[PDB]
């Protein structure tokens, strides 16, 4: 069963005595129904919808990396509402292993 990543005590040792757990808000913000402008036409309302996607949002950490909107299933990865053609570039499921080959390295 999965119980999280394994931690060695050495990795829990801080580099400063004042280090605490970063208090970054992971609430993306306040939202509601997407509100279109009357002036916008069909094309410009499409752009508006594409700019309100929660799955394109993320939270930036103190070191500049961002934790993205994540989901257990790929159903939450398409634009909402679903466009006619979704996964043009095949979504990549990344598997990890310990195998390596020499060609990838240089001395």
């Amino acid at each position: 069963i999965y119980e999280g990543q394994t931690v060695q005590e050495s990795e829990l040792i801080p580099q400063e005595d004042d280090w605490v757990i970063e208090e970054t808000n992971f609430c993306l913000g306040r939202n509601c129904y997407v509100r279109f402008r009357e002036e916008d036409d069909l094309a410009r309302r499409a752009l508006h919808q594409m700019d309100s996607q929660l799955n394109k949002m993320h939270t930036r950490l103190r070191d500049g990396t961002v934790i993205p909107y994540m989901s257990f299933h790929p159903d939450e990865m398409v634009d909402r509402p679903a466009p006619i053609h979704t996964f043009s570039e095949k979504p990549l499921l990344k598997w990890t292993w310990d195998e390596t080959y020499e060609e990838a390295y240089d001395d």
């Binding site: 257990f72 790929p74 159903d75 509402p81 006619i84 979704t86 996964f87 979504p91 499921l93």
Partner: protein
């Protein structure tokens, strides 16, 4: 275009749209039944038009099973998300997907047209001969609808099976749920077609299978060899939805994924070999009865494992998240409701208990709690979860605690009293009854009118 579209997601919307439309006719028939049963006497159907009631109950059952819940849970949600869950661009067979929905609509038009034009008589949704074969042409029309529906179901099953060849990710539990239902259809439908053809032969080709020296019990074997696999073809997609909703909304990874998957496979194999629990009162041999009773009780084991795995999904979830969303409430309500339906199923599984409870309203309440409450709520919960992806609006459902509470209370007012009258006893498929059963029938009728009123508040 509208009818020419091959987009798998558009077709999924069509399936839900058509299920709601046909569903209006289904609910109306249900209201007729409950109105009639409000007291003893004739209320809305004349004593000279009792054949109409027999037709109402027959069409109610057939439409809700084959034209509403099956197109909604096996055609609607599946055609919209399955290709996305499989990280594939679109469904494997685009043109077949288009014709399947068109076929469903055409078979629906045939059925309703037969109401208007043919004499109205009924033989139950189980079309038992010899009654089914001594009827009028409306029975012939209904047979054509079922055969046509069978074509759509099988080709759709072929479509989903081909996802195994193209799936680019992991087969999630929901995908496993649809694949196994597809397998159940591929193995059960061909048997149904054969027995339906024999019904036609006796109706239209002067065959003699269902007259003396021919065993009428033969039909019941072949029919129910498809019948019970059908009830699991209708519930398994609902189970798949429940798994996704609980994991997503609670932000918890599915526990015992492989046991969930192996529980679905197990239910299918067992569901393919227990059909004769519908034929307990015919007079089968003692050993046959004991075999079927034994295997029927076994189905509870895999079904029980899934229920408990769902419970732990909801346990321990963060309190800060708002739990009043309609999709979450419906998913939780499914566990509470399905246990009631399943337990009563185990009660009726004991054949000696079944002698008293066969062809009584206890059976009605049993399969209503699972389908009319559990399956409906599961389809609603699934659509509600995909509201943003689907994009529909102009309804007040997403956060409506009044609708959920009123629905739960009133739906139980309808069918809980039907368990009581099962030991009274009130037979099924009847319209008139003794005056001492009015109280419970009246209470259930009050429940039916109330549920309909609550369906108007969503708009």
């Amino acid at each position: 275009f509208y009818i020419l579209v091959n987009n798998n997601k558009r077709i999924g919307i069509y399936y839900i749209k058509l299920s709601i439309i046909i569903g209006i006719l289904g609910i109306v028939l249900s209201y007729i039944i409950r109105v009639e049963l409000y007291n003893s006497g004739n209320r809305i159907i004349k004593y000279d038009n009792v054949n109409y009631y027999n037709m109402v109950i027959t069409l109610h059952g057939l439409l809700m099973i084959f034209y509403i819940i099956m197109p909604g849970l096996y055609g609607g949600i599946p055609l919209y998300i399955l290709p996305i869950l499989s990280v594939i661009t679109d469904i494997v067979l685009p043109r077949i997907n288009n014709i399947s929905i068109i076929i469903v609509l055409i078979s629906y038009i045939v059925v309703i047209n037969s109401i208007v034009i043919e004499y109205n008589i009924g033989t139950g949704w189980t079309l038992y001969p010899p009654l089914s074969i001594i009827g009028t042409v409306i029975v012939n029309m209904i047979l054509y609808g079922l055969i046509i529906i069978g074509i759509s179901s099988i080709i759709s099953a072929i479509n989903f099976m081909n996802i195994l060849i193209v799936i680019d990710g992991i087969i999630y539990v929901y995908i496993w749920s649809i694949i196994i239902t597809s397998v159940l259809l591929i193995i059960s439908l061909p048997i149904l077609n054969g027995i339906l053809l024999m019904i036609l032969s006796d109706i239209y080709f002067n065959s003699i299978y269902f007259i003396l020296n021919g065993d009428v019990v033969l039909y019941q074997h072949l029919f129910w060899y498809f019948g019970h696999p059908e009830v699991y073809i209708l519930i398994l997609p609902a189970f798949g939805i429940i798994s996704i909703i609980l994991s997503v909304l609670n932000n918890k990874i599915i526990f015992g994924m492989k046991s969930m998957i192996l529980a679905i496979i197990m239910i299918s194999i067992l569901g393919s070999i227990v059909w004769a629990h519908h034929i307990y009162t015919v007079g089968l041999e003692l050993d046959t009865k004991i075999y079927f009773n034994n295997l029927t009780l076994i189905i509870s084991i895999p079904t029980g494992n899934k229920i408990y795995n769902w419970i732990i999904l909801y346990i321990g979830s963060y309190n800060i998240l708002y739990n009043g969303y309609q999709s979450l409430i419906f998913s939780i309500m499914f566990i509470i409701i399905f246990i009631i339906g399943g337990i009563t199923g185990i009660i009726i599984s004991i054949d000696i208990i079944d002698i008293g409870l066969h062809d009584t309203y206890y059976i009605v309440s049993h399969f209503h709690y699972i389908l009319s409450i559990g399956a409906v709520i599961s389809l609603l919960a699934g659509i509600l979860l995909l509201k943003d992806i689907i994009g529909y609006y102009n309804v007040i459902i997403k956060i409506n605690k009044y609708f959920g509470l009123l629905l739960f209370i009133n739906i139980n007012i309808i069918f809980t009293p039907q368990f009581i009258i099962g030991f009274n006893v009130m037979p099924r498929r009847i319209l008139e009854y003794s005056d001492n059963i009015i109280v419970w029938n009246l209470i259930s009728s009050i429940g039916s009118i109330s549920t309909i009123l609550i369906l108007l508040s969503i708009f």
